[PDB]
Design a protein around this ligand. Structure first.
Ligand SMILES: *[C@@H]1O[C@H](CO)[C@@H](O[C@@H]2O[C@H](CO)[C@@H](O[C@@H]3O[C@H](CO[C@H]4O[C@H](CO)[C@@H](O)[C@H](O[C@H]5O[C@H](CO)[C@@H](O)[C@H](O)[C@@H]5O[C@H]5O[C@H](CO)[C@@H](O)[C@H](O)[C@@H]5O)[C@@H]4O)[C@@H](O)[C@H](O[C@H]4O[C@H](CO)[C@@H](O)[C@H](O)[C@@H]4O)[C@@H]3O)[C@H](O)[C@H]2NC(C)=O)[C@H](O)[C@H]1NC(C)=O
Ligand SMILES: *[C@@H]1O[C@H](CO)[C@@H](O[C@@H]2O[C@H](CO)[C@@H](O[C@@H]3O[C@H](CO[C@H]4O[C@H](CO)[C@@H](O)[C@H](O[C@H]5O[C@H](CO)[C@@H](O)[C@H](O)[C@@H]5O[C@H]5O[C@H](CO)[C@@H](O)[C@H](O)[C@@H]5O)[C@@H]4O)[C@@H](O)[C@H](O[C@H]4O[C@H](CO)[C@@H](O)[C@H](O)[C@@H]4O)[C@@H]3O)[C@H](O)[C@H]2NC(C)=O)[C@H](O)[C@H]1NC(C)=O
Ligand SMILES: *[C@@H]1O[C@H](CO)[C@@H](O[C@@H]2O[C@H](CO)[C@@H](O[C@@H]3O[C@H](CO)[C@@H](O)[C@H](O)[C@@H]3O)[C@H](O)[C@H]2NC(C)=O)[C@H](O)[C@H]1NC(C)=O
Ligand SMILES: *[C@@H]1O[C@H](CO)[C@@H](O[C@@H]2O[C@H](CO)[C@@H](O[C@@H]3O[C@H](CO)[C@@H](O)[C@H](O)[C@@H]3O)[C@H](O)[C@H]2NC(C)=O)[C@H](O)[C@H]1NC(C)=O
Ligand SMILES: *[C@@H]1O[C@H](CO)[C@@H](O[C@@H]2O[C@H](CO)[C@@H](O[C@@H]3O[C@H](CO)[C@@H](O)[C@H](O)[C@@H]3O)[C@H](O)[C@H]2NC(C)=O)[C@H](O)[C@H]1NC(C)=O
Ligand SMILES: *[C@@H]1O[C@H](CO)[C@@H](O[C@@H]2O[C@H](CO)[C@@H](O[C@@H]3O[C@H](CO)[C@@H](O)[C@H](O)[C@@H]3O)[C@H](O)[C@H]2NC(C)=O)[C@H](O)[C@H]1NC(C)=O
Ligand SMILES: *[C@@H]1O[C@H](CO)[C@@H](O[C@@H]2O[C@H](CO)[C@@H](O)[C@H](O)[C@H]2NC(C)=O)[C@H](O)[C@H]1NC(C)=O
Ligand SMILES: *[C@@H]1O[C@H](CO)[C@@H](O[C@@H]2O[C@H](CO)[C@@H](O)[C@H](O)[C@H]2NC(C)=O)[C@H](O)[C@H]1NC(C)=O
Ligand SMILES: *[C@@H]1O[C@H](CO)[C@@H](O[C@@H]2O[C@H](CO)[C@@H](O)[C@H](O)[C@H]2NC(C)=O)[C@H](O)[C@H]1NC(C)=O
Ligand SMILES: *[C@@H]1O[C@H](CO)[C@@H](O[C@@H]2O[C@H](CO)[C@@H](O)[C@H](O)[C@H]2NC(C)=O)[C@H](O)[C@H]1NC(C)=O
Ligand SMILES: *[C@@H]1O[C@H](CO)[C@@H](O[C@@H]2O[C@H](CO)[C@@H](O)[C@H](O)[C@H]2NC(C)=O)[C@H](O)[C@H]1NC(C)=O
Ligand SMILES: *[C@@H]1O[C@H](CO)[C@@H](O[C@@H]2O[C@H](CO)[C@@H](O)[C@H](O)[C@H]2NC(C)=O)[C@H](O)[C@H]1NC(C)=O
Ligand SMILES: *[C@@H]1O[C@H](CO)[C@@H](O[C@@H]2O[C@H](CO)[C@@H](O)[C@H](O)[C@H]2NC(C)=O)[C@H](O)[C@H]1NC(C)=O
Ligand SMILES: *[C@@H]1O[C@H](CO)[C@@H](O[C@@H]2O[C@H](CO)[C@@H](O)[C@H](O)[C@H]2NC(C)=O)[C@H](O)[C@H]1NC(C)=O
Ligand SMILES: *[C@@H]1O[C@H](CO)[C@@H](O)[C@H](O)[C@H]1NC(C)=O
Ligand SMILES: *[C@@H]1O[C@H](CO)[C@@H](O)[C@H](O)[C@H]1NC(C)=O
Ligand SMILES: *[C@@H]1O[C@H](CO)[C@@H](O)[C@H](O)[C@H]1NC(C)=O
Ligand SMILES: *[C@@H]1O[C@H](CO)[C@@H](O)[C@H](O)[C@H]1NC(C)=O
Ligand SMILES: *[C@@H]1O[C@H](CO)[C@@H](O)[C@H](O)[C@H]1NC(C)=O
Ligand SMILES: *[C@@H]1O[C@H](CO)[C@@H](O)[C@H](O)[C@H]1NC(C)=O
Lengths: 122, 225, 449, 200, 48, 48, 122
């Protein structure tokens, strides 16, 4: 569980299976943990929604029909899976996450599933 | 909003007194209070602080036991006490709110202590009692810069005091300076004229004064020798 | 390179959520209806479930923390709860013909307790009820005549009587978080509360914690380990109270040494009052005893552990408090239900340089609190017959630095406190709440169909 | 125990520094308009918060720490001070440059021979027609300054707006025979002025 | 102007202005308050 | 019960009485003592 | 967001991406908005369930192995994507939605996934 976030990305890639395990794992003062469990569920579902509206939905890992952007911190192939970590990446990435999402959720499946319709007919 | 300092006040050597900082516009309980003092032309000084929660305080080493600062949560008021007064305690006294320290979730946070909100101050003046009609002394000219002289008046109480020049007949080149609180707890000042150099010997000069709180009018003939 | 996302990634950030308790199982069985207040608190994971973390360091801030204030709002909430249905006391703000004592108990216990007598509502409405009871000096106040007094609260704040079935025993509570939220757990022993902590685990069900209730003195708390620890948000700020944690348990034995008797006064229906009766045999003041030389050596290792900040040679001195309310001016606390205030004056009249019986300091008992400045309501601490004795460990302290404006000449300390939240920070020093996001995307030369 | 000048003066709409010096601790700055509650300005060596004019610019350089001011508005006449925890600055009366740098006039008068007949030696130093009303004053017996029993006023309005003030020394007549070159010494705007009396 | 069916007189009529009507109200006496003490806690507030 | 009366000031019949100057006992902070007191009220808060 | 429900069906088809965007978008009197968010979640999930039990589940658009019914308002191909709107359709459709559902949820995947099993074996 979250075993070694300080291990590099290529090492950490081996299992993505326990952080997704205990992430659900099965009166006033009694109202509260209800109010907490409910948004834990909402966060899980916001996730699964942002996921399904991407070509992903297929759990955990998912290749995608959009590449990279130079300016988005031009770096190298061995410099990150072998020399970096996760937050280490997303703190940098904080500055561009939004339009990343925006282009996935639009320019992908919407085009992709409409093109699919254009062949799911013949 | 702000804070309510009681008005200025006179008391006496030794003795003791109490001073009030009333708080309006927020959370008396949160935040913390401090007190400060400026003496006769002096770099301001720290006095002490109180967290109005439990009541804990910290009196700096040289003022421990001297001071007694307190609170009343219900009246939402801060209080201070001072004992065995001396002239060296003649000053003006501020309470003051810090927001960056004290109980409650609301904290603006700063490394330096916050002196956010300020009471107007309370001037404390220790005047040894009775009144005493003053004592006038002549300051004469002598040995350029055209001649000048006056009469001082000393260790009286209370101010003010009237000084006139030949029943106040002359008012050309006169100034009557502010009083001064000597250590003694009483006051002293002086009235001054300047004159030509040949204006001596011929034209001569005296002081009218009166301290009517003691009912004491005085005429003194000032003479250079 | 294309893009590809990952669900379950190791990334989180600074967030604070609502959290829930956990009170294990063996506490659950003791028959007699309700406990502490954990009514629906769910038992503890019976195994230590923690994960050490490899090459990770991030920054704990014990004052910028939150779960401390979570537990604070929680405990004043359940404070309100606890007594909410308990018995009211409105017919006690009544005149009180009183007097002192009649037994050979020295001026050491002269009067102080009072033998008041007065009328009262009966079970019914008509009849009055001439009665009498005994009270600590600090529950009563003169009014300008023989001896008629008032209770302290009756010009400020009404008062309810705690249900006697309640017991004031702190019980280890495991605060446990929801998912998506993790608790970073610092695991070095040298962490002055602020900054990044390398040695860390990840945890959800924090250890069992007793919310000990005391001022100046910290009781039954957690240990430090090798070199006793001290923490301040910025001690140069003298006003920032200083919180210290011991590696060494201080033995303390407190005792209220008189055999009391209880009165189920009948101010009925239903609502029954509980008064003090006359006392069995002799009368002696409550107090506490502590091992002299252990005290000596702990304050040694302390004064050793401070001049690091204030020059290996500085003048140290301690003293009794700067004058506060009885809660902060003394070691206020509870033992066995009733409430002590100990004259901690005796343990600080000392001055420290550079590198036999046992101590008996007395405490006086009070029954009328309105704690956390939560006035508008007061609690009557009901009596307990028999005597009271109290084993405790002392593990930390709350202190105040004098601001002796010099350079680093003489610096002197006193037992601070007042703000109760520190007794929580003093076991919250070691935790941080983090919101994890299982999502993280990376470019890579991978195509879809 | 912080520095801060004795007084500063400048024309409106200009740009002025106020320095205070002590330690690398976090200074902050505040404002005494006369007969007005102090009003805190900048916290923590640089940043101004809510309801404050941008014109104020605090900075530091370690131990020293200063405040630059944009656009001098005379509605900001008065005293200014810095602090750093229990260590405090000694006030700074910023006045504005209205009228000319008035050199003061200093007069030293001896003890009346009738004071001597009442055995209390009283010496006076008097400062007149000066501006800006912002001066300091030390005494000098023979070749030595003095600490005992010195009082000094706070300057104020003469008839002709310019300023007036007084220093009183109380010594006993033998203490006044014992040093000969008794003397009063003032500092007005850097310029140091003296006058002297001897027992005669 | 609006009515659920104004022919039904009993249906109150509600009207909205395009024009703001200036109105200045004043209770023109300087009162004084009494923290009566019917304590504990509960304090009454009377006219002086 | 409320031993009352009207007004004592030159304020015309335009403000004649209407406000009332009632006087009565009351609970103290404590339970025993009564509390002879008095307060002023608009005419529509009271009834004969 | 719900931009122009009055634009015809073929025009409206272009984006179905923002109505599914803000549809989640990330003490008494405090109990209520909890009671509201919860059934918003239930409505979303009732949807996703009715969706997955159909061959659809694949978000937004999904072709299906059942055709039309004459009687169900015989009309034309250009008369609806070019001349009609959404509620405009479903107000008519109100009279037949139920057995539509019934036949999808049964006669489809149940047959379809069992036939699939019959080939997911060889
Ligand atoms: C916190 O710290 C304070 C301060 O120290 C403690 O206060 C102490 O409290 C205890 C009890 O509360 C007090 O004990 C009483 O002592 C008196 C006086 O005894 C003296 O004189 C006789 C001769 O006259 C000596 O023989 C006694 O020697 C006793 O101690 C020595 C060792 O030092 C021991 O070897 C002796 O035998 C003797 O002990 C007892 O011996 C036998 C059994 O061994 C026993 O039968 C006998 O009674 C002795 O108690 C001593 O120098 C003594 O009279 C008292 O007993 C009687 O009266 C009480 C009251 O009615 C009865 O209950 C009891 O049964 C006896 O009838 C007590 O024993 C002590 O004086 C006091 N002060 C000091 C300085 O110790 C607190 O108790 C501490 N509290 C906590 C929580 O830590
Ligand atoms: C709602 O509507 C009602 C009805 O109109 C208002 O009721 C009015 O309320 C105001 C105040 O509440 C009343 O004002 C008072 O007027 C009296 C009488 O003044 C008359 O006689 C003198 C000579 O005897 C005239 O000079 C006066 O002329 C005044 O008005 C003219 C313009 O019309 C002006 O040019 C004059 O200068 C003069 O005004 C004032 O002048 C100077 C400064 O300019 C000022 O120092 C002076 O006192 C004048 O007030 C006028 O014809 C007047 O005596 C009162 O003043 C004194 O008594 C009160 C009570 O102690 C003091 O507070 C005050 O300081 C004075 O000592 C008042 O000013 C007015 O009569 C009354 N009725 C009418 C018809 O206006 C409500 O106020 C409205 N409320 C709201 C919320 O809308
Ligand atoms: C606390 O004060 C109460 C007063 O209400 C004391 O109770 C009363 O105490 C007096 C003596 O102080 C008792 O008087 C005697 O009573 C006995 C038995 O009735 C009788 O034989 C004697 O002739 C004399 O009248 C009185 O009865 C008693 N009453 C009650 C109801 O207790 C109480 O003793 C005081 N307690 C302490 C510890 O001081
Ligand atoms: C710190 O921990 C110690 C160790 O337990 C606590 O001492 C305990 O004190 C309580 C009363 O405050 C005792 O409770 C009572 O125990 C007796 C007999 O054990 C029983 O008759 C009562 O019904 C009640 O349960 C408790 O027993 C005692 N601990 C032990 C092991 O005996 C101490 O209270 C703790 N600190 C604080 C501030 O409470
Ligand atoms: C903290 O310690 C100081 C000194 O170490 C204590 O100071 C003392 O304060 C008390 C009460 O204000 C003074 O007491 C008076 O004593 C007479 C004769 O015994 C008594 O009859 C009076 O009723 C009064 O209580 C005492 O003179 C004064 N100085 C000393 C040396 O004791 C202070 O009480 C301590 N405070 C705390 C909270 O620990
Ligand atoms: C409303 O009614 C109350 C009655 O409770 C009035 O209070 C009382 O008013 C009378 C005069 O109407 C006061 O009498 C005089 O008192 C002064 C000072 O004590 C004394 O010098 C006179 O010889 C005479 O006795 C009385 O003291 C006063 N008492 C109190 C407690 O207020 C009140 O004035 C009435 N207010 C109005 C606006 O009508
Ligand atoms: C309890 O009630 C009795 C009455 O039953 C009180 O006794 C009276 O006290 C008053 C004092 O003001 C006297 O004037 C009466 O003469 C007493 N006797 C009666 C009324 O029969 C007694 O003082 C009350 N005790 C309290 C309130 O503590
Ligand atoms: C007070 O401190 C003592 C230290 O001797 C504690 O005794 C230890 O208790 C822990 C847990 O209960 C055990 O793991 C240790 O082995 C005990 N020490 C020894 C020497 O056996 C005692 O429990 C503490 N009491 C409290 C905190 O109430
Ligand atoms: C405190 O006083 C009570 C009442 O006198 C004592 O209770 C008695 O205790 C003895 C001895 O334990 C028993 O034989 C009696 O049956 C008890 N009676 C009642 C009514 O409780 C109590 O024991 C005293 N405290 C101590 C520590 O002995
Ligand atoms: C506090 O109480 C404990 C237990 O009552 C004391 O410890 C005992 O100490 C004696 C000698 O002082 C030993 O003979 C016992 O074996 C100890 N027993 C236990 C359980 O600790 C301790 O000394 C007391 N301390 C003070 C200062 O009173
Ligand atoms: C706590 O203890 C100290 C001393 O142990 C008490 O101080 C004494 O106070 C009395 C009050 O009359 C004085 O007469 C004594 O002279 C004081 N002691 C000394 C050594 O001077 C103190 O009052 C106690 N109580 C509190 C609340 O601090
Ligand atoms: C202050 O600390 C000293 C310890 O250095 C205490 O000293 C005592 O002095 C008295 C007489 O002067 C002796 O009878 C005691 O035996 C001494 N005790 C100790 C431990 O040395 C002194 O009592 C302390 N002050 C107070 C108020 O307790
Ligand atoms: C209403 O009456 C009160 C009480 O007389 C007035 O309060 C005083 O107001 C003056 C002038 O503003 C101040 O100088 C006093 O310090 C105030 N005293 C108190 C106790 O409040 C009030 O001003 C009156 N209303 C108006 C509008 O002036
Ligand atoms: C307030 O209480 C007093 C008593 O303290 C009342 O005065 C009594 O009024 C009754 C009227 O029925 C008379 O019979 C008594 O003789 C009065 N004097 C007493 C009892 O000493 C007064 O009327 C009360 N005022 C109210 C209720 O408004
Ligand atoms: C990539 O980022 C750069 C910023 O330098 C921007 O100019 C470019 O348009 C981005 N790529 C696309 C496809 O928008
Ligand atoms: C990154 O790769 C480029 C070639 O694409 C190479 O020139 C450069 O040295 C590499 N630098 C790092 C830090 O990997
Ligand atoms: C009761 O004790 C107080 C406390 O000093 C005293 O004033 C009073 O005289 C005592 N009364 C009796 C009856 O002993
Ligand atoms: C605490 O204050 C000191 C001096 O004011 C400063 O050097 C330090 O940066 C502050 N903050 C800390 C120690 O976190
Ligand atoms: C289509 O609807 C008609 C109604 O006219 C009905 O007779 C027919 O059975 C329906 N089609 C199927 C396949 O049930
Ligand atoms: C619908 O299409 C039919 C042919 O299938 C045609 O005969 C008819 O005119 C069309 N009507 C409309 C309204 O589209």
């Amino acid at each position: 569980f979250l075993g070694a976030a300080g291990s590099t990305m290529g090492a950490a890639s081996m299992t993505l299976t326990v952080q997704a395990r205990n992430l659900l794992s099965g009166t006033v003062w009694g109202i509260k943990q209800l109010q907490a469990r409910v948004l834990a569920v909402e966060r899980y579902l916001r996730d699964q929604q942002l996921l399904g509206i991407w070509g992903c939905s297929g759990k955990l890992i998912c290749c995608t029909n959009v590449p990279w952007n130079s300016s988005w911190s031009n770096r190298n192939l061995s410099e990150i899976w072998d020399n970096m970590t996760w937050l280490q990446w997303d703190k940098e990435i904080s500055n561009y996450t939004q339009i990343i999402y925006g282009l996935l959720e639009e320019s992908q499946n919407q085009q992709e599933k409409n093109e699919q319709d254009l062949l799911a007919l013949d | 909003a702000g804070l309510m300092q009681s008005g200025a006040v006179m008391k006496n050597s030794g003795a003791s007194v109490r001073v009030s900082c009333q708080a309006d516009g927020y959370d008396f309980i949160d935040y913390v209070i401090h007190w400060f003092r400026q003496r006769r032309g002096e770099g301001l000084e720290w006095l002490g602080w109180m967290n109005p929660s439990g009541g804990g305080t910290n009196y700096p080493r040289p003022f421990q036991g001297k001071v007694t600062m307190t609170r009343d949560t219900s009246t939402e008021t801060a209080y201070l006490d001072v004992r065995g007064l001396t002239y060296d305690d003649t000053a003006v006294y501020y309470c003051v709110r810090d927001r960056a320290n004290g109980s409650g979730r609301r904290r603006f946070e700063s490394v330096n202590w916050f002196l956010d909100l300020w009471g107007r101050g309370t001037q404390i003046t220790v005047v040894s009692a009775s009144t005493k009609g003053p004592s006038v002394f002549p300051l004469a000219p002598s040995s350029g810069g055209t001649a000048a002289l006056g009469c001082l008046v000393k260790d009286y109480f209370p101010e003010p005091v009237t000084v006139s020049w030949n029943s106040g007949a002359l008012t050309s080149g006169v100034h009557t300076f502010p009083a001064v609180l000597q250590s003694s707890g009483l006051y002293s000042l002086s009235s001054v004229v300047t004159v030509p150099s040949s204006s001596l010997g011929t034209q001569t000069y005296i002081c009218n004064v009166n301290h009517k709180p003691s009912n004491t009018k005085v005429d003194k003939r000032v003479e250079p020798k | 390179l294309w893009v590809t996302v990952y669900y379950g990634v190791p990334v989180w950030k600074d967030a604070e959520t609502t959290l829930f308790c956990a009170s294990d199982a063996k506490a659950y069985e003791t028959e007699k209806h309700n406990v502490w207040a954990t009514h629906a608190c769910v038992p503890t994971d019976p195994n230590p479930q923690e994960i050490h973390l490899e090459n990770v360091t991030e920054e704990f801030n014990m004052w910028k923390n939150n779960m401390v204030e979570q537990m604070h709002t929680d405990i004043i909430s359940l404070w309100d709860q606890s007594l909410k249905p308990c018995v009211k006391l409105t017919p006690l703000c009544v005149t009180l013909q009183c007097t002192n004592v009649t037994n050979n108990i020295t001026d050491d216990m002269r009067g102080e307790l009072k033998n008041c007598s007065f009328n009262m509502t009966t079970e019914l409405r008509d009849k009055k009820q001439k009665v009498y009871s005994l009270f600590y000096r600090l529950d009563v106040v003169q009014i300008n005549s023989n001896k008629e007094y008032r209770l302290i609260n009756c010009n400020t704040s009404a008062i309810t009587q705690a249900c006697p079935k309640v017991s004031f025993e702190p019980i280890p509570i495991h605060y446990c978080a929801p998912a998506g939220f993790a608790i970073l757990k610092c695991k070095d022993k040298k962490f002055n509360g602020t900054g990044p902590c390398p040695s860390v685990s990840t945890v959800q069900c924090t250890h069992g914690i007793k919310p000990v209730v005391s001022t100046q003195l910290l009781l039954n708390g957690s240990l430090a380990e090798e070199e006793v620890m001290i923490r301040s948000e910025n001690i140069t700020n003298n006003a920032k109270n200083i919180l210290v944690q011991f590696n060494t348990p201080v033995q303390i034995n407190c005792t209220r040494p008189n055999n009391n008797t209880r009165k189920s006064i009948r101010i009925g229906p239903g609502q029954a009052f509980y008064a003090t009766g006359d006392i069995i045999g002799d009368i002696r003041q409550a107090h506490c005893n502590v091992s002299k030389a252990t005290w000596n050596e702990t304050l040694g290792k302390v004064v050793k552990q401070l001049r690091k900040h204030f020059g290996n040679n500085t003048i140290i001195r301690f003293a009794n408090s700067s004058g506060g309310d009885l809660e902060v001016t003394t070691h206020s606390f509870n033992c066995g239900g009733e409430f002590f205030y100990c004259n901690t004056s005796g343990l600080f009249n000392s001055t420290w340089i550079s590198n036999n019986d046992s101590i008996t300091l007395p405490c006086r008992i009070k029954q009328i609190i309105n704690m956390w400045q939560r006035i508008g309501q007061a609690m009557y601490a009901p009596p307990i017959q028999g005597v009271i004795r109290c084993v405790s460990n002392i593990t930390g302290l709350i202190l105040t630095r004098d601001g002796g404006s010099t350079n680093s000449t003489t610096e002197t300390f006193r037992p601070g406190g007042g703000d109760m939240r520190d007794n929580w920070r003093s076991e919250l020093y070691k935790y941080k709440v983090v919101k994890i996001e299982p999502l993280g995307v990376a470019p890579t030369r991978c195509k879809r169909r | 125990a912080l520095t801060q000048p004795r007084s500063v003066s400048a024309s409106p709409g200009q740009s002025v520094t106020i320095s205070c010096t002590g330690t690398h601790n976090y200074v902050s700055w505040c404002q005494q308009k006369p007969g007005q509650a102090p009003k805190l300005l900048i916290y923590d060596f640089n940043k101004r918060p809510s309801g404050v004019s941008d014109r104020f610019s605090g900075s530091t350089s370690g131990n020293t720490a200063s405040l630059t001011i944009s656009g001098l508005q005379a509605d900001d006449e008065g005293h200014y001070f810095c602090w750093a925890f229990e260590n405090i600055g000694g006030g700074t009366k910023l006045t504005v440059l209205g009228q000319p740098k008035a050199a003061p006039s200093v007069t030293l008068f001896p003890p009346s021979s009738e004071e001597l007949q009442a055995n209390k030696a009283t010496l006076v130093c008097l400062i007149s027609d000066f501006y800006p009303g912002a001066v300091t004053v030390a005494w000098k017996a023979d070749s030595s300054p003095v600490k005992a029993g010195v009082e000094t006023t706070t300057p104020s309005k003469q008839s002709n707006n310019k300023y007036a003030a007084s220093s009183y020394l109380s010594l006993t007549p033998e203490q006044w025979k014992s040093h000969r070159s008794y003397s009063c010494q003032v500092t007005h705007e850097g310029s140091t002025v003296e006058k002297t009396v001897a027992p005669t």
